[PDB]
Amino acid sequence: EIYCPAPPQIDNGIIQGERDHYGYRQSVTYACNKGFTMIGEHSIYCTVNNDEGEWSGPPPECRGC
């Protein structure tokens, strides 16, 4: 099983129930902290190409206020 690199953390937001390992097509969901507005995708998933794991795209951003 190919594993993606650890999902990226974001400023003023969290990963909902982060797992130890992420495999093909497994997804990580983000949530912004109280007072912050999410701008971007609510979640990203593990893409697997040429035997290397890679996240589908960048994590969302949490902008304040």
Side-chain angles (χ1 to χ4, degrees):
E1 203 199 289
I2 292 151
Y3 292 122
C4 267
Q9 300 293 150
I10 59 181
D11 296 340
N12 299 307
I14 66 186
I15 286 166
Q16 284 179 326
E18 185 168 359
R19 279 126 122 305
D20 201 11
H21 291 206
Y22 290 94
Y24 179 55
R25 280 315 170 90
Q26 285 198 315
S27 124
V28 359
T29 310
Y30 292 92
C32 287
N33 294 334
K34 199 214 204 311
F36 293 84
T37 305
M38 160 167 311
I39 311 199
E41 303 269 6
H42 213 305
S43 66
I44 60 185
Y45 63 93
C46 182
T47 83
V48 171
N49 287 94
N50 288 308
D51 291 338
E52 196 135 22
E54 188 207 38
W55 292 99
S56 67
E61 161 213 52
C62 293
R63 162 178 330 166
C65 309

